[PDB]
């Protein structure tokens, strides 16, 4: 029997970091960038009018007096695809965002002119560069758009699109395969007969894997002789950083599946000094030693084991810096018993007392265990009783 | 010009609550359940061994060796009858033989295969999961209004429900309009600009909790644009269109939008993002946000008005973002009478754990890069100087 601390050390030390992948930028939302992204295109990609007015050479509208009419030879709107070159002493009507004519260096505001349609007279001077959004004003080639290690949010995705990057290298979510094993199991579209039970765990643990941040594939029930089970597990090893199997621990009924797991890797089935969920296992499969969690058939115990050991492996594989959960001290509302020598993890309801802002916790047979829990009372190994009014550690299930 | 409060009030009241949908239970994770789900069968449907051992009558082991007359594994579908003073080996989960009432654990016996000696007694019912121990008919597995987490998904599977009625995420269509726009896999020619906003606003819609379809660039004459918008109305609770306010470039799309509903383009007393619009399209009055081409302003408008509508469509009551007080690090300018939303970087001072904020508002590259917050400047405040304590909207990732 190992402690919770020793088991957590084993599984976390074995965690496999997924290899970076290059993906379309929209699919990178919430993922950590795995490369430094430099802009290859300027933003804006061309000099633009910053206001409605007339693209000119500043010197032709008094732009160098601080050191009369001009022909209007074109009109440019946003999206214009035709090249336009400004000759000396010429003006081109421009709308905000329009591509500036070549050889212009300023925009005379509409309000600073007589608004002439064929010939325009400047009523006030503009200096060179004024009211122009120059090419590369916001971003130049070589500028760092996204740094390695940054989480890609909506603004970063917008930045990638603004510099013409359609794909980006990211650290992907760890891939998890969830498998249920047992001759008693039937899927939820079937009618269980004598000796048959619905496959609860593949659905609940796949959901817990998604909430933890993994890229989860629910295989469901793996049925057949051990060689067929081995075939199934091997196929999941090709596509997984984490494998979770229920029904592989418990007794003689899983001797065959454990035999096949021993042919695929190093399997450890030493118990953990915890409750519920003392009976569990952990293996490293294949040449890359992929973590394989062996969980029991009990759905409540499996969820507790998943939260205690699988979720931290998911979080570190994601590049997260807080692996564990927040732990708060709360006042017990009801009586709880615990095994002497085993750490207790009691699914509970954590609340704030309106009259004192103090945290209160209520401990919550399958219906009660699978009910609405936002906390787990963490009972030390040597503690055997919790009474109302006792202050206890509560793991907050955010 | 209307205030931020007035515009937020307008869009919130127009939010469309999605109709419930029946979906596969795995796809219901994190959604609110829209129906009461009752168990129809007792769980388990049969007495099963809770451990490896010997199914017996407790009285026969002192609750004297017993002959072992069979072995039952998990998944056995045939009934088996235990005679007096007999034992049958059982695996965990195996159906208990009829007329047995307890399981003697393997470790509490001499492990005999033909005759078994109990080392200590077990009482009636011990190590047995009786029929209906887990769930009884009529038991409420999931209540209407409960959020479906992993445990509730497990409960739905335990009562044999493959599908469940839920309140779905609001469907949002994101559309970009403008003759200058090209998609990001193209090489922009003369006058062409990458379509930034459809990507950034679709991503913001997903983070807000919407079911987002990014239509991308809607191109063509106004009648074709109307055709596109009408198709998006069939599948949306929210529509977001950029490039429909700004100038002459959007005259066509505003014309067809006015044919589909009542469009309001009154400016909002805010900066950035004063230029915007809002309409309700078709007989189902689908909210339609008209956002500008400026990507920073569009993200600010989305955060300020679209995100609350998403959260309102989800039925959430908790405030939008957390607001923390922080010490200003640099100077910020604001117009009197307009609410400021300045993208900023919020940090904690190591020497005192106090919150500090640095305003990032060229500035677009920095503003969209290292930003985790927005300084919220009141209408009557015209300047923030270093050392000022200000409200910072925390943009949690
Ligand atoms: Na204990
Ligand atoms: Na102000």
Residue numbers in the entry:
A (entry chain B): 1 to 67, 78 to 374, 383 to 416
B (entry chain A): 1 to 63, 78 to 375, 382 to 417
From the article:
In this work we have identified Glp, a gephyrin-like repurposed molybdotransferase MoeA enzyme, and its membrane receptor, GlpR, as components of the corynebacterial divisome. Our studies show that Glp and GlpR form a tight complex that is part of the early divisome, where Glp and GlpR directly bind FtsZ and Wag31, respectively, placing the Glp–GlpR complex at the centre of the divisome–elongasome transition.
We crystallized Glp alone and in complex with the 10-residue peptide FtsZCTD. The structure of Glp is consistent with its annotation as MoeA, the enzyme involved in the synthesis of the molybdenum co-factor (Moco), which is present in all forms of life and is used by molybdoenzymes to mediate essential cellular functions such as energy generation and detoxification reactions, and to support virulence in pathogenic bacteria. However, a pronounced hinge motion around the segments connecting structural domains I and III leads to an open form of the Glp homodimer compared with the closed form of E. coli MoeA. This conformational change, also seen in the absence of ligand, generates the FtsZ-binding site within the central Glp dimer interface, far from the putative Mo-active site. In the phylogeny of these homologues, we identified a monophyletic clade that contains Cglu Glp and whose sequences are distinguished by two conserved proline-rich (pro-rich) regions. These regions correspond to the linkers connecting structural domains I and III, which differ between Glp and E. coli MoeA and are responsible for the hinge motion that generates the FtsZ-binding site in the former.
